[PDB]
Design a protein around this nucleic acid. Sequence first.
DNA 1: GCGTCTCGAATCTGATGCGTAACTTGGATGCTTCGTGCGT
DNA 2: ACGCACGAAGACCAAG
Lengths: 332, 331, 329, 74
Amino acid sequence: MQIEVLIRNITPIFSAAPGSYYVSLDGTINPPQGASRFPLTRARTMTVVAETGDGVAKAVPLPIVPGNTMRNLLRRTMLKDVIEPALRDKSAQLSIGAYATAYAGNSSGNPDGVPSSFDEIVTMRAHPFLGLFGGGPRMLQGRLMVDSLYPIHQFSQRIIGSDYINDSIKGGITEIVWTRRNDPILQLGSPDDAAVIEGGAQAANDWITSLLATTKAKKGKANGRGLKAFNAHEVVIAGVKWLWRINVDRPSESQIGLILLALNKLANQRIAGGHAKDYGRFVIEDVILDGESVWTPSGVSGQATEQFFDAIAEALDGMTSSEFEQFAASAK
Amino acid sequence: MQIEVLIRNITPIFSAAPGSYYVSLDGTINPPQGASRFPLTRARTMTVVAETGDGVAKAVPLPIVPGNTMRNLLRRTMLKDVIEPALRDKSAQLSIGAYATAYAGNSSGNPDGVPSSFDEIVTMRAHPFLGLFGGGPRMLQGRLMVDSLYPIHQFSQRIIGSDYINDSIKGGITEIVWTRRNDPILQLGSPDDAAVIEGGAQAANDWITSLLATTKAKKGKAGRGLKAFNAHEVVIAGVKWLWRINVDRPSESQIGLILLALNKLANQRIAGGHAKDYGRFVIEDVILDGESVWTPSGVSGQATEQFFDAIAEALDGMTSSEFEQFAASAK
Amino acid sequence: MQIEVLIRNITPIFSAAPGSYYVSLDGTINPPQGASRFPLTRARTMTVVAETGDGVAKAVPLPIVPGNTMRNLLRRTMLKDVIEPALRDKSAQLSIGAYATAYAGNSSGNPDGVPSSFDEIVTMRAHPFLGLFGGGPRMLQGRLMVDSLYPIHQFSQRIIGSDYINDSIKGGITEIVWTRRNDPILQLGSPDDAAVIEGGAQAANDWITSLLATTKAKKGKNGRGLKAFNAHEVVIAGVKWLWRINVDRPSESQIGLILLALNKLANQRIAGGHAKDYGRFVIEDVILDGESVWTPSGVSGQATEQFFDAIAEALDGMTSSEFEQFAAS
Amino acid sequence: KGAASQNWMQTSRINTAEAARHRSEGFLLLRAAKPNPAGGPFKNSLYHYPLVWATLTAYCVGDQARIADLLSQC
DNA sequence: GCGTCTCGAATCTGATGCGTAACTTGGATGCTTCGTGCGT
DNA sequence: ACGCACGAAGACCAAG
């Protein structure tokens, strides 16, 4: 089954791209060495082939959110909001290994390397949760094919198709945000402010003297680091529409219902990093279930989704920690 | 746990954008090099997608106050008005590292690579203050999600929603203020005026002639004097802003602390322009998970009584040991 | 009978290349020993000779999907979509030998080696499915000869040809995707999060203590934790590929089965990356001996009507006994 | 050889998920509880063969026309 | 059911710091026979 | 009675 979810980000989305980048005050990435450069954490981009207005196809970078991040977002929503409430309602306790297996796929970094029995595989792949994600010490194949988050853009037309052209945005959708850190002891201006500090004025003077000496040493040399920092990070602007495509390999109605419940409770979560700055906030606009729209103002609802919700409710009522414990158990 | 705050700025808000921009005398930003190019300090804007009324999405610049600025404003308000007075009553003194960690999230730029124990995480995430603002040598994740300050504009309806449409403003909300610096000696033109200067008229004459020589050398060439003419760009006064503060699973004490900070938030300025009294604002409304809890005398009502009681009890039980444990490095 | 299948990948295609490769945070493959190294799982590449700036052609790595992978993909499509349902409609049951022969060409059903008579060879090499993919104890030669998935690229013009110069890409078509695994216990923030764990806070404390001890011991100097940071190379999305399938002397049934699989091929993935939804694609053109037989609704038209009728008749009269006889069980 | 030989790796495996599903649904008649990737019907195998770009040249005594006609179908 | 002269000029036309930190740094599997029970 | 199933076992050098 193919699920396409339409997402609009209320707040900017920030997915850090690994690797050191530098930007100048003007806003030029990796500036010439003559000017001053500041560390920059760029938003993750995926190179894609786009047919621009010229008619030729060229590889262009596209700011996206990784499919692994979206998969973990779905898994965390499912666990924290559907599975774990049921387990606690029935007073079901997972072991630490079962917990780590449910939240990260495996309970350690060493796969067993021993095959699973056929009945065990059938039992797990029919499970509402372990069937979708799989993993475990005996690395099982899940049913969930979860994709990245591609913005509806001129550059993503060849990927996501041309049925969302009305939501397409032409120009760059990426913005740079500058961040500062200050030394608190430098903003003291009265003995009252330093009264809460043990030692007080003497401690503040010692701190400032050490800071001055360290700054002079660093200037001359051009090993602790101070609290003064000025850097930037790159974010996707707020208000851009994204397409999320979820495929599931022949699922039972319980698994479809579980995915639908996660989608219903997904907007309460946040897509990527940027917790302090309230990044990653979004709202779901339309959820398409096998080519048909099943999204209402309330959420995923309608007559077509009743069977999935009933099946997942029954599965949750019958769900116990035994399946998780058996899945997470190691043969050796 | 969602808090929406409606803020109207009494005085212009000046959140400077890093980078050297230039403005001509007639208000054109980055003018052609033929004309004059007095420097300009631009108000910070964040590109946002907005519908211009024609049904087409457009990326337009929207002047905002950064979320980091407002988060530090909240942290400083809490520390200066609630946490420290509670600490002062018991004569509990934070160490220099603990104070630095409380006010900036760390005591040094080098974090510890180890993860903090679960007991420490449970102890700190339940703390009224350190739970909200994470950090420390071990990267604890705080419960506070502070967003940027978005003006209620036509360009921010796609972001702040349509709940506040009567407070929206259509045109540009940004203006240029021209700032000038004089040379006191040039304005000094009486013998009594120079009577207070060491050397009397000789020192002023030396100053003026040295200034003339430096100016002539600099003009011929094609240390900097005192005379200046610049411009800084501010958001006009009277615009309404929406501040969105989100907290994930807070205790009663933490919500009480946030509401206490919001009660005394207007006593502090938002960003920039301390000399010129910029950043002054008044809170129009505080929405507490869809419920308006703002009274004319602050956040009041039975709906908020338990939060205030919980935070009062927590402050009465507040000791510096939590701060010292939080700020202590594990290596 | 040549089949030319033009394929455009919606999502990146990840065919993991064997071997231990390393990359740094900046993206440098196999960095010097000075900097930190992270494991990398590169995409499959075939060394081909290409005219790099004219002059003298030099060997360049061309990212492809191996021909065996797509042979098995066609086999799996046939079985899952038109063969296994057909056998279920008859309530057919396959032994282990017949199943192994059908799904992997294995000879474990009767590894002694069985002599095939000429009449038997005629009967079984004309089987709509088993004729295309030979094997089993008989090890009959299959009628199918599929090629690898070569992208329409500047370096593949000597393999693909100059027939698709309009859909060619000049730059590199690979990228590095970084993957991270987190320890879930390190991300607990309250006893509410630890309620579902049997040990509560004590189990999490023991887990974190053991993790700290192991990390310190490894730093000073067995078991591995959950935290991991690694990378893998995928072929970027949108690149066009050309797939060539050939048959030596097909019956109508075998060509019809090929066309049915092509109609149902887009439902499957290419290479690996099932978790990340890697290998999604759309068929853009199927060419049957120089004529285009692809419509928006799939392979259709009058030019391919005989094959579909023949394969429908063969499927209706399909019995598990043919599979058992082919497997010599 | 126009280029160095490349060691081409190929494998062979039966999907254990599909096999288990078929065993459950009765399509496959297997009584064994678990697969054995080391050997048996569900064995994974790893093998390699080299790939070379080459110009094949050989010398023969025979009819040019018929040899060229035979090689036309190759 | 009135207009000329006037209809500017000269500066200024930034300055300083900050200008990263810590971890992660892979894992497992690709044999077949022989003996002893256990399902058709 | 006969075929299938399941575990123990035995070759073992060993790098850049």
